[PDB]
Amino acid sequence: MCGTEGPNFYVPFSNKTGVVRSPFEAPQYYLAEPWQFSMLAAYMFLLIMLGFPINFLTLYVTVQHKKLRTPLNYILLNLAVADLFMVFGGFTTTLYTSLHGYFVFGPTGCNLEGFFATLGGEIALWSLVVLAIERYVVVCKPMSNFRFGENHAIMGVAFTWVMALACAAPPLVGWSRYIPEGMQCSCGIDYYTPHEETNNESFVIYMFVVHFIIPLIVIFFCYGQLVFTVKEAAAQQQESATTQKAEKEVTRMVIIMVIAFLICWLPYAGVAFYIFTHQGSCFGPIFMTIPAFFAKTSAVYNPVIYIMMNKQFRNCMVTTLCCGKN
Numbered sequence: 001m002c003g004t005e006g007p008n009f010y011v012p013f014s015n016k017t018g019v020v021r022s023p024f025e026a027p028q029y030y031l032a033e034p035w036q037f038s039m040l041a042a043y044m045f046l047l048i049m050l051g052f053p054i055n056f057l058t059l060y061v062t063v064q065h066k067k068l069r070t071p072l073n074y075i076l077l078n079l080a081v082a083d084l085f086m087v088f089g090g091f092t093t094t095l096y097t098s099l100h101g102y103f104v105f106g107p108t109g110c111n112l113e114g115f116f117a118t119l120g121g122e123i124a125l126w127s128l129v130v131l132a133i134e135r136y137v138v139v140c141k142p143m144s145n146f147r148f149g150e151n152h153a154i155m156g157v158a159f160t161w162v163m164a165l166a167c168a169a170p171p172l173v174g175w176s177r178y179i180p181e182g183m184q185c186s187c188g189i190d191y192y193t194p195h196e197e198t199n200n201e202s203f204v205i206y207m208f209v210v211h212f213i214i215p216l217i218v219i220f221f222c223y224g225q226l227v228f229t230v231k232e233a234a235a236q237q238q239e240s241a242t243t244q245k246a247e248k249e250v251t252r253m254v255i256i257m258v259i260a261f262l263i264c265w266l267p268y269a270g271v272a273f274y275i276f277t278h279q280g281s282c283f284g285p286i287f288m289t290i291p292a293f294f295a296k297t298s299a300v301y302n303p304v305i306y307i308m309m310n311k312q313f314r315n316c317m318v319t320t321l322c323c324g325k326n
């Protein structure tokens with residue numbers, strides 16, 4: 001008996017003292033001191049001030065630079081858009097509610113902010129999956145007469161939207177649900193209550209397998225094969241100093257991407273492991289929300305790694321910031 005249940009919410013605090021209030025009606029300052037809600041606000045401000053420009057600039061320099069508009073880059077624009085859903089559907093709403101100390105938009109606002117913030121993060125996730133599939137296809141050439149073009153790259157983007165809707169949309173119609181989470185200032189999928197009426201258990205399993213396990217396997221396989229192919233090819237051309245240089249930098253970049261993905265991925269896996277063993281206790285506000293706190297920062301560091309470290313975008317972005325010169 002660690003928390004307080006109500007219709008459409010679960011406050012991770014016991015009501016034995018009678019102080020708990022609906023997170024839709026009154027501030028949750030028994031979960032956390034006001035200054036900690038402010039620090040939640042400050043963190044959201046940081047993510048907005050870094051996350052909007054980087055992702056907006058990614059869309060903006062693609063409009064100004066013809067050479068960026070290649071099919072292999074479409075999935076990166078999708079990534080930028082997904083991050084902006086997170087920045088505006090998620091961080092902005094949470095900055096605003098955090099300063100009230102509760103989710104001031106009510107259960108309807110909870111579904112909206114939950115849906116769009118879950119959709120944004122899901123589209124990003126699957127964009128990294130699809131980008132890895134695309135790079136694997138282009139480099140390892142597993143179809144003999146195949147050339148990756150505009151129509152294929154559109155399919156990849158559409159695919160991320162289907163996968164993201166497949167996670168974000170069921171809680172809207174009765175499989176899982178959106179509720180306040182953590183300090184009750186933002187809304188998300190309910191993996192926190194063993195709700196039976198909406199079959200929460202099977203959605204968590206389905207999330208775990210399809211939207212957590214499968215992405216990691218596909219990302220590791222595609223990039224593993226790719227590094228193997230590039231090393232193998234470079235080994236056959238050891239007379240080419242640039243081939244060796246290119247190999248070293250492809251390898252080093254895959255390592256950064258995979259480690260970045262694990263930095264986002266392992267906190268969920270560590271916390272989920274706690275859920276299987278050490279089931280006994282129930283704990284909050286944080287909880288499995290430690291990964292979520294840090295997974296939000298992927299709206300900032302993913303564009304840094306996949307876009308800002310891409311040689312083309314960097315030079316185009318410099319040209320654009322410097323009003324066309326240098």
Ligand SMILES: *[C@@H]1O[C@H](CO)[C@@H](O[C@@H]2O[C@H](CO)[C@@H](O[C@@H]3O[C@H](CO[C@H]4O[C@H](CO)[C@@H](O)[C@H](O)[C@@H]4O)[C@@H](O)[C@H](O[C@H]4O[C@H](CO)[C@@H](O)[C@H](O)[C@@H]4O)[C@@H]3O)[C@H](O)[C@H]2NC(C)=O)[C@H](O)[C@H]1NC(C)=O
Pocket residue numbers: 004005006015017018019020021022
């Ligand atoms: C966590 O736990 C707390 C404590 O149990 C819950 O808060 C209580 O919620 C109940 C309602 O479910 C509140 O009861 C209602 O309070 C109203 C005002 O009561 C105060 O004001 C009157 C003057 O009007 C004083 O005389 C009185 O002494 C109180 O100080 C009333 O309007 C309500 O009355 C109606 O309902 C009752 C039954 O509940 C009927 O019998 C009546 O006829 C009347 O129609 C009722 O009294 C209670 O005040 C809350 N307590 C506190 C401390 O806030 C939380 O709901 C719970 N949290 C969650 C998330 O569930």
Ligand SMILES: C[C@H](N)[C@H](C(=O)N1CCC2(CC1)Oc1ccccc1O2)c1ccc(Cl)cc1
Pocket residue numbers: 118121122125167189191204205207208211212261264265266268269271272295
């Ligand atoms: C919506 C998000 N795109 C997605 C996410 O937050 N969820 C909820 C948390 C998650 C993975 C899926 O579910 C679980 C269920 C039980 C145990 C642990 C769990 O971890 C997500 C997917 C991958 C990554 Cl690396 C980050 C986040």
Ligand SMILES: CCCCCCCCO[C@@H]1O[C@H](CO)[C@@H](O)[C@H](O)[C@H]1O
Pocket residue numbers: 090114117118121122124125128181186187188189260261264291292295296298302
């Ligand atoms: C590397 C790409 C991974 C993207 C991870 C996205 C992080 C989103 O984090 C998610 O936020 C949602 C609402 O904000 C909540 O429903 C989830 O509890 C939380 O895991």
Ligand SMILES: CCCCCCCCO[C@@H]1O[C@H](CO)[C@@H](O)[C@H](O)[C@H]1O
Pocket residue numbers: 219220221223224227251254255258
């Ligand atoms: C998702 C898959 C990530 C693959 C990263 C592989 C990292 C390998 O790293 C490489 O290993 C070689 C030996 O195999 C060494 O000779 C190289 O110095 C080293 O760069």
Ligand SMILES: *C(=O)CCCCCCCCCCCCCCC
Pocket residue numbers: 318319321322323326
């Ligand atoms: C050429 O590529 C650059 C043109 C001139 C740019 C110089 C101004 C950049 C300032 C960036 C720092 C903003 C700080 C804001 C902190 C809140």
